[PDB]
Design a protein around this ligand. Structure first.
Ligand code: HEM
Ligand SMILES: COc1ccc(C[C@@H]2NC(=O)[C@H](Cc3ccc(O)cc3)NC2=O)cc1
Length: 394
């Protein structure tokens, strides 16, 4: 006898398990057990993944309900699971989204300057260099301090909350609450700090004193800062880190992008499509009985949308494991989600990765792993797949 199939399948972000294609072919919606012991429906085809993400009756907010089957334990207050809904209800969606585009004057130049400086320091120190801890993550952290309008020197401590905040744990995490409360206090102080006049926090600080927003809670204003820093930094840093592995392991593509950097956006779009950064399916709770393929999902059941199930589906992306810069549907992947909860930072995430890769290929055209790929240490029980260190030479 065997137990019910358990998720996640593997924390390795450098290869997709053969099991994904087998599940997609035979049972594209199938029952699994999560790390909490709850049962859930794992959805692994493009068609069914899009169906779930485009049907709001599969609710993100309701995953936080007491007594629901859980993918993992909450690391934020339950109301924060509805973060974007709360922002929209407060009338703040347009302002938040405008503050996090890559189009602000000097922002892309700041990204280039920061990437080039980080790479120069690695070259000066000499190989081996750690492209996660000393390139991709500091670049993400610096970018988000700039976007938020907060001091660069405050970034590292905020960043160090993230190895706990984005855990995917069976049980509540005491350190997550300690860091959350402290980071909220920091952002509340930022709102009261007269020097904070630019970026997202500068804009929220002004809106907070605008009579049209007098009803919006100070709790929400501080939460926007903590959540956008955390989600943005963990997502951009982890994506860039694993995209760099994908690129390093494809010297032909690395050389092509080095020779023709105008192909970098199309390359990054494929790197997004094949990216394994999300360690768990996206969770949703059914609020009605809904037919998904061969399964009638019942009200109150947990559904997990496996992004790499959709993104490696050969019925949507022929030869799905291959990076093709001339696909007819290149942005139709689900790396940024789909539907109501589509990532509001997608343009900034694209630009972070494009500029980081452009700078790396210019400064380190001979970049290669400095250890055998199997020697990378993949973080476990985390909401992202990332190597703890990414040792390279050039
Ligand atoms: C390459 C980088 C990124 C990737 C791959 C990514 C991925 C995703 C995905 C898949 C979702 C959908 C989650 C779901 O439906 O359950 C999402 C939502 C979200 N992302 Fe991103 N993200 C990235 C960058 C960013 C950045 C830079 C920010 C902010 C500065 C950000 C903030 C958010 C927020 C707040 C949500 C929730 C939106 C909602 O619930 O409506 N992300 N992201
Ligand atoms: C791209 O990753 C996500 C992850 C989760 C959600 C759902 C919902 N929306 C959010 O805005 C924050 C994100 C967050 C921030 C900080 C933190 O310590 C933990 C999580 N929490 C949520 O639960 C959305 C996107």
């Amino acid at each position: 006898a065997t137990v019910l199939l358990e998720v996640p399948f593997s924390a390795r972000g450098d290869r997709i398990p053969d099991a994904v294609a087998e599940l997609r072919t035979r049972e594209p919606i199938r029952k699994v057990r999560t790390i909490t012991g709850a049962e859930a429906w794992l959805v692994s085809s493009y068609a069914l993944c899009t169906q779930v993400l485009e049907d709001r009756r599969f609710s993100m907010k309701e995953t936080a309900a007491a007594g629901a089957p859980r993918l993992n334990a909450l690391t934020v207050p339950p109301e924060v699971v509805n973060n974007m809904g709360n922002i929209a209800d407060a009338g703040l969606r347009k302002a938040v989204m405008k503050a996090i585009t890559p189009k602000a004057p000097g922002l892309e130049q700041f990204l280039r300057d920061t990437a080039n400086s980080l790479l120069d320091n690695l070259i000066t120190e000499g190989a081996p260099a750690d492209l996660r801890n000393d390139f991709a993550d500091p670049l993400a952290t610096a970018l988000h301090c700039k976007v938020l309008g907060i001091p660069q020197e405050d970034g590292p401590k905020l960043f160090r909350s993230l190895s706990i905040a984005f855990m995917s744990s069976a049980d509540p995490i005491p350190a997550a609450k300690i860091n959350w409360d402290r980071d909220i206090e920091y952002m509340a102080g930022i709102l009261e700090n007269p020097n904070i006049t630019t970026g997202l926090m500068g804009e929220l600080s002004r809106l907070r004193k605008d009579p049209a927003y007098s009803h919006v809670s100070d709790e929400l204003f501080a939460t926007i800062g903590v959540t956008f820093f955390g989600a943005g930094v963990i997502s951009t840093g982890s994506f860039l880190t694993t995209a760099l592995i994908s690129l390093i392991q494809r010297p032909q593509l690395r050389n092509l992008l080095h020779e023709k950097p105008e192909l970098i956006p199309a390359g990054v779009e494929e790197l997004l499509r094949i990216n394994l950064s999300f360690a768990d399916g996206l969770p949703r709770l059914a609020t009605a009985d809904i037919q998904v393929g061969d399964v009638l999902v019942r009200k109150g059941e947990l559904v997990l949308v496996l992004l790499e199930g959709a993104n490696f589906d050969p019925e949507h992306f022929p030869n799905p494991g291959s990076i093709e810069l001339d696909r007819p549907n290149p942005t139709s992947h689900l790396a940024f989600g789909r539907g109501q909860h589509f990532c509001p930072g997608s343009a900034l995430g694209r630009r972070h990765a494009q500029i980081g890769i452009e700078a790396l290929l210019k400064k380190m055209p001979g970049v290669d792993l400095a250890v055998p790929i199997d020697q990378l240490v993949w973080r476990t029980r985390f909401q992202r797949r990332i190597p703890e260190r990414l040792p390279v030479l050039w």
